[PDB]
Amino acid sequence: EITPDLWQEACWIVISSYFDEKGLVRQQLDSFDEFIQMSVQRIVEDAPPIDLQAEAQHASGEVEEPPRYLLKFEQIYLSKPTHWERDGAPSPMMPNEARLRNLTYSAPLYVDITKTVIKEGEEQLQTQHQKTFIGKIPIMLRSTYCLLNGLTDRDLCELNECPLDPGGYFI
Amino acid sequence: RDSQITAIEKTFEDAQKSISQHYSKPRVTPVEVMPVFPDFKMWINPCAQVIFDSDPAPKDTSGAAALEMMSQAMIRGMMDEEGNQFVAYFLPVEETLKKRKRDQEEEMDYAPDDVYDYKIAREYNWNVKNKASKGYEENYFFIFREGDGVYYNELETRVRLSKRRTNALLVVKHRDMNEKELEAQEARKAQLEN
Amino acid sequence: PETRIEVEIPKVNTDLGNDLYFVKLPNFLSVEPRPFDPQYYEDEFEDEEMLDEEGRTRLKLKVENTIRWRIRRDEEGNEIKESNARIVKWSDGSMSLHLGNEVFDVYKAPLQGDHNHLFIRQGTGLQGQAVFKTKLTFRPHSTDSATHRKMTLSLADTQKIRILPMAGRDPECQRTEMI
Amino acid sequence: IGQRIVATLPYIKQEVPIIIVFRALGFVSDRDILEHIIYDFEDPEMMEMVKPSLDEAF
Amino acid sequence: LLLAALGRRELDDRDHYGNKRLDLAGPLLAFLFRGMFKNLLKEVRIYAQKFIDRGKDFNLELAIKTRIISDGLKYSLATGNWGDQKKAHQARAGVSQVLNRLTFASTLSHLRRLNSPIGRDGKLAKPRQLHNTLWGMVCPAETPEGHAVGLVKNLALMAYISVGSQPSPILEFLEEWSMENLEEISPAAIADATKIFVNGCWVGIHKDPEQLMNTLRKLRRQMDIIVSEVSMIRDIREREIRIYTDAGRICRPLLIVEKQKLLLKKRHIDQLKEREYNNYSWQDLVASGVVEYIDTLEEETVMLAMTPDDLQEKEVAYCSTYTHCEIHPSMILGVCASIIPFPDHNQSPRNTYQSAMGKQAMGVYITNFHV
Amino acid sequence: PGFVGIRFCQECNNMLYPKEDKENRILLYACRNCDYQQEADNSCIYVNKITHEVDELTQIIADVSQDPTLPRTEDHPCQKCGHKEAVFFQSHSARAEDAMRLYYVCTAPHCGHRWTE
Amino acid sequence: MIIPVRCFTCGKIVGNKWEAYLGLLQAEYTEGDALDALGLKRYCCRRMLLAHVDLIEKLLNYAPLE
Amino acid sequence: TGTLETQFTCPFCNHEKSCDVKMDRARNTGVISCTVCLEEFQTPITYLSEPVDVYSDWIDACEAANQ
Amino acid sequence: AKQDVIEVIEKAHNNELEPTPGNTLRQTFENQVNRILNDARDKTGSSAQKSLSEYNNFKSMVVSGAKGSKINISQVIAVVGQQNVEGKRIPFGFKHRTLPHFIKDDYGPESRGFVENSYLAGLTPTEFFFHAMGGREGLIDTAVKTAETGY
Ligand SMILES: [Zn+2]
Numbered sequence A: 001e002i003t004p005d006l007w008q009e010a011c012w013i014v015i016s017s018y019f020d021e022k023g024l025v026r027q028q029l030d031s032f033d034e035f036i037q038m039s040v041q042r043i044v045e046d047a048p049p050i051d052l053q054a055e056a057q058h059a060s061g062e063v064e065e066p067p068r069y070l071l072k073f074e075q076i077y078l079s080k081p082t083h084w085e086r087d088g089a090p091s092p093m094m095p096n097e098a099r100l101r102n103l104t105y106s107a108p109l110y111v112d113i114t115k116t117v118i119k120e121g122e123e124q125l126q127t128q129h130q131k132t133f134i135g136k137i138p139i140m141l142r143s144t145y146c147l148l149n150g151l152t153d154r155d156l157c158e159l160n161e162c163p164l165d166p167g168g169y170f171i
Numbered sequence B: 001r002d003s004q005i006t007a008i009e010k011t012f013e014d015a016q017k018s019i020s021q022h023y024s025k026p027r028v029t030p031v032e033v034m035p036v037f038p039d040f041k042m043w044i045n046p047c048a049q050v051i052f053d054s055d056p057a058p059k060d061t062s063g064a065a066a067l068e069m070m071s072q073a074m075i076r077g078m079m080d081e082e083g084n085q086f087v088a089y090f091l092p093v094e095e096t097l098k099k100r101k102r103d104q105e106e107e108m109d110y111a112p113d114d115v116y117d118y119k120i121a122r123e124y125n126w127n128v129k130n131k132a133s134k135g136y137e138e139n140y141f142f143i144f145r146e147g148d149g150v151y152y153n154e155l156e157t158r159v160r161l162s163k164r165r166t167n168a169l170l171v172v173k174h175r176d177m178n179e180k181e182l183e184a185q186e187a188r189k190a191q192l193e194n
Numbered sequence C: 001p002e003t004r005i006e007v008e009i010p011k012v013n014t015d016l017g018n019d020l021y022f023v024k025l026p027n028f029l030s031v032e033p034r035p036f037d038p039q040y041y042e043d044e045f046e047d048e049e050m051l052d053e054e055g056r057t058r059l060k061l062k063v064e065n066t067i068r069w070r071i072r073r074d075e076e077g078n079e080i081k082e083s084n085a086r087i088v089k090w091s092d093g094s095m096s097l098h099l100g101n102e103v104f105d106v107y108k109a110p111l112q113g114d115h116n117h118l119f120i121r122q123g124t125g126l127q128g129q130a131v132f133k134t135k136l137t138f139r140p141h142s143t144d145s146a147t148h149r150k151m152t153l154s155l156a157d158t159q160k161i162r163i164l165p166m167a168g169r170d171p172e173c174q175r176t177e178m179i
Numbered sequence D: 001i002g003q004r005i006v007a008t009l010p011y012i013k014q015e016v017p018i019i020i021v022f023r024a025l026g027f028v029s030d031r032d033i034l035e036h037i038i039y040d041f042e043d044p045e046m047m048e049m050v051k052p053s054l055d056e057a058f
Numbered sequence E: 001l002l003l004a005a006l007g008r009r010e011l012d013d014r015d016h017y018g019n020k021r022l023d024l025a026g027p028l029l030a031f032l033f034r035g036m037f038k039n040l041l042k043e044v045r046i047y048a049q050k051f052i053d054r055g056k057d058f059n060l061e062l063a064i065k066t067r068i069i070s071d072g073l074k075y076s077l078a079t080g081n082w083g084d085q086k087k088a089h090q091a092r093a094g095v096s097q098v099l100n101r102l103t104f105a106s107t108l109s110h111l112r113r114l115n116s117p118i119g120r121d122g123k124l125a126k127p128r129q130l131h132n133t134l135w136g137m138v139c140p141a142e143t144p145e146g147h148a149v150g151l152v153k154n155l156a157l158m159a160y161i162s163v164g165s166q167p168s169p170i171l172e173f174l175e176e177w178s179m180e181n182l183e184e185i186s187p188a189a190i191a192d193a194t195k196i197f198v199n200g201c202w203v204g205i206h207k208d209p210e211q212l213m214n215t216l217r218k219l220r221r222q223m224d225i226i227v228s229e230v231s232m233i234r235d236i237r238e239r240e241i242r243i244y245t246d247a248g249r250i251c252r253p254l255l256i257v258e259k260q261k262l263l264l265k266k267r268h269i270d271q272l273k274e275r276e277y278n279n280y281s282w283q284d285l286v287a288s289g290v291v292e293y294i295d296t297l298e299e300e301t302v303m304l305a306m307t308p309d310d311l312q313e314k315e316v317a318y319c320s321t322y323t324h325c326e327i328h329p330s331m332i333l334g335v336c337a338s339i340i341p342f343p344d345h346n347q348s349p350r351n352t353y354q355s356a357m358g359k360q361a362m363g364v365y366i367t368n369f370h371v
Numbered sequence F: 001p002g003f004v005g006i007r008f009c010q011e012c013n014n015m016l017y018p019k020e021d022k023e024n025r026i027l028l029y030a031c032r033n034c035d036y037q038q039e040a041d042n043s044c045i046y047v048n049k050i051t052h053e054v055d056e057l058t059q060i061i062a063d064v065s066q067d068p069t070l071p072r073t074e075d076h077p078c079q080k081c082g083h084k085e086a087v088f089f090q091s092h093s094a095r096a097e098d099a100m101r102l103y104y105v106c107t108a109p110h111c112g113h114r115w116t117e
Numbered sequence G: 001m002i003i004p005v006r007c008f009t010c011g012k013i014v015g016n017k018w019e020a021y022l023g024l025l026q027a028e029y030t031e032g033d034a035l036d037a038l039g040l041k042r043y044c045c046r047r048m049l050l051a052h053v054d055l056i057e058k059l060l061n062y063a064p065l066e
Numbered sequence H: 001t002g003t004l005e006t007q008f009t010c011p012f013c014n015h016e017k018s019c020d021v022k023m024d025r026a027r028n029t030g031v032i033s034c035t036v037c038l039e040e041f042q043t044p045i046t047y048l049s050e051p052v053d054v055y056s057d058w059i060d061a062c063e064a065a066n067q
Numbered sequence I: 001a002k003q004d005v006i007e008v009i010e011k012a013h014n015n016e017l018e019p020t021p022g023n024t025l026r027q028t029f030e031n032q033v034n035r036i037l038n039d040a041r042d043k044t045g046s047s048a049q050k051s052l053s054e055y056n057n058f059k060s061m062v063v064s065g066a067k068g069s070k071i072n073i074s075q076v077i078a079v080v081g082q083q084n085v086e087g088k089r090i091p092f093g094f095k096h097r098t099l100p101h102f103i104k105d106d107y108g109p110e111s112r113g114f115v116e117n118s119y120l121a122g123l124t125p126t127e128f129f130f131h132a133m134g135g136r137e138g139l140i141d142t143a144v145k146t147a148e149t150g151y
């Protein structure tokens, strides 16, 4: 067991291991990482699915059964933060570039939408638009969806970024 | 597909390379290198992990006596006053400890004319999770045999025991395995090929 | 009064070796008890799906971190059992698991509090075999590897988001479908 | 005569006596309602306090 | 309510941190995104309606107005107004602030800042007072000395905020232990039996709370069913067991004490000292069940030593039943408050003023400052 | 004086109210719904302790003996079973709290004796 | 960022001693014996090498805007 | 959520806020009368009964009678 | 002084403490303890005053009246004293105790905020936090008073 004599060393060894595992901004990163991994998916599928029924125009002179539309948002995909030049050429957007060019460091969000339509008494044939794009979500630096994740000191300095920067903020 | 086979074969080939120095702390050197294999001897026996809510050792016996008794303990399903089943934990009596040691020293599995007595110690409510229950995860145990290798085996059943709320002695006589038990071993052996 | 209950059961004899260790495999380690043979090999139809990199990460671990053994015949036809993994004991008493080129630290921890016992199932009863004294936990060495970064996802293993490979025209994809 | 208990339910423009809320949930008899509140009937001190609410919802 | 009216149970305290949760960047963004996404489906509804009432086919790729999420998120993160721009004057302001890049300690402390939604200019002192419940969770010294004094707080060095996990694994484990489902039990049985609450949902009653608590703690200490964030509080006088798995619970790590002895023995320190060669780390310390994350609501029932080497020997026994031990009592300070040398030799307002000025002191604020 | 409590109707299980038997001049308990009624055994309709003297000891529970954050004394042996270890604490109930009186519970299972000195 | 040329308090040149001090510390010298070896007697001069942090080594990790 | 209604649209002549409720707490009866078409309805009330309960009894009697 | 407070606590726990006029029993107990601890702090400070040499620079700055008071000398040298919030000793923020480090129903000096160390000797962590709680009141009053008095 740890004697009183050694306890002052042991105490700071335990603390140092805590701060090596968890940075100082771990609560931020974790929160955001869990939002992207869970809360966005959950929010989409928990939304009420669209039910549209056309306004009866009565042009046949009778009470018609107007067609109704069904859409269900399904799986969510999120790519890394990307910058497209004005011509659409794709490039990974470096945080530092964003910081200099006044960009917003965000990732595009895509969602599978299965469309379905029920015309009066006739059959419905669900068609689907895979990975349609919904807006961009801003990414918090140094999270798992960031580009600076698990990157070594050589890499960070190569990206003109600071290895000591805690991350945990949005651009 | 073969992009995977080629990589797998590489891991065996890399495993054939002799080791001579530690991957860090350079003054250290390898004392023993052991291949890891499924325990071809033990895989036929369905090993189960029993987790007690509290120390099951009998209060008056400490140290080696407690370990030897518990290592030979037997657990059996019992039926209560209303007929609902529970679990009885039995420990070997002192003669059984002596007999087991005698037969082991005589290299016999059991003496064919002897009966081994175990006394009930406690009643426990039991919760059984096995491979057949949804979301069951496999725990393993590793046996290190010096100069032979490290052989691992699977804990097919996980039993969690909690203190429940008849002073009975379980008298055990050994018998040969029947065809159904042998078939169960062969079926387990089959998990190693085809 | 001592109540006599008589039962007939075969005795299970166990060779517990020198040390018995409890092992809970982390998500980044797995074990295949069948011998690795490319013939009749597992129909690992993961790449058939053309999975994204959360899945190719899973596939990488599936190939690289599985402890496997195989039967190989020498020129005499003798069947030799070979393992792609091996545990090394060091002069300082530490241990590490070497799997081909992968290396993992192995930490020995005594099981305090948990009264975990090894029993063998026999019919409707259980025969005691041993008390687990130490458990082994494994961690990858070579933290400089990107796989170390990615292994965090294996720990995280309800639908979850998927990650696209940054591909596409998207401002133009917006604009073009918009036409 | 005093100490009536009222619940402010969401979307309900007025306070409702809790005993009415329990009857609305389907627990019609006063014994059954009190069983969900006064776990130990051996407690006259606590029961004397619910009487005003049982009275209001009579 | 009856208990409180009879006075058998004390009233609840709004400033006790066991009764508080922190909305971090995750639940904050989920709160926006929920609104925007619901708006996005409002627009797909009105757009498709315009097309389908005419009998034509509405193309959803045109119906999705991409901009609603993109500019929605962006807007509130840019201005700090946490709500739809159409109704900006009704939503919270300053939730998102420009990171303070004047000095590294200001950057670090700004990333570790807590805010109380209490309206400023409020005469009430209680919400601004340093409640005892903040010990080790929130820095007792780092708070602005202006009008925001005590409302704006900062995390202690080892304060962790739970990210949250689903309770289903726990519920399954409870159902397999001897817990009566609330729907099955006879009301008469609730009298002499503890009431178990999971995330505030009363889910059952249990006859033997002592074995249950010992089991639940053993699980958490092995990281299997119960993740280490979960906090089990045993209200003995109340006969209630409350298990929380939700997000936002502020908690901190503590050493475990089973008898008058730490669970942290020299073997752990030795392995920890070598963590460069072998990757032994904090995770192994937690997994070996030597350390534990205690939450404020759980801390009301733990008996905590400050230092083992003096408060576990005795002359005339003071406690003799400690359950946890502080790692190091200086971990109660925050980022700016822990750079102060000898803060325990200073008057506390001086410590507070140094915490405030430590964010205004010049230095190299980041290594890539030339970029 | 005692402390009067609720009485329930055997037919509908609703609460019974006191009624004087206008004829037999005795006390009856009667259901406001069904015509059920029964003869009262107490003759006391209500009581109200103004002093609020309450035997605070009765609300103490034996489970408190295992609280780790509660002080312990070997100096006050259990009056019932003689066990030395006892936990002691004050009556934190608004009317009892003013008195600062101590209450002791035996730290021995299945004894559970609670007393005051 | 870079070792100061002169001790702020007295003026002794200490800009030529950071590399030497690093070399002495590369040997097993205790920083107090290192400081004595470098001839820093007054505490004002010793404060310069004990408290100096060489950030220019970090700033050099970045590729230059040649 | 909000304040409870005290004036109602006569379910017959549909004139808005034309109906008011007189509550005879003594005879345990509520009386509602359209100040436009003079239609009236009366229902037994209790001490819990509010104007909204009388109006409802009127609507329930109308909805039951118009079948 | 600590022994005297302990004796008062024993008398209170045994109900040997008679409630003084106007006050309740719990209030008379708090008054008794505050009296004992105030006597302790004042006496230790006074003993500190007479021990200071004529060249002591605290005394030179206190007897001149330029800056400081004898209470500051007392707190720096002898003992800091009782830490109060809203005029009362530190409240039971947790259930019936001031910090998880103390045992339930502990009305002793260090359990309720009495800082027994001096600023030279340093403050124990529990009474460090209690000193922070006491000093927070000054900051809050400073922030809220300005808006009431300016109006
Ligand atoms: Zn009735």
Ligand SMILES: [Zn+2]
Residues within 6 Å of the ligand: F078, F079, F080, F081, F082, F083, F106, F107, F108, F111, F112, F113
């Ligand atoms: Zn006793």
Ligand SMILES: [Zn+2]
Residues within 6 Å of the ligand: G007, G008, G009, G010, G011, G012, G042, G043, G044, G045, G046
């Ligand atoms: Zn100098």
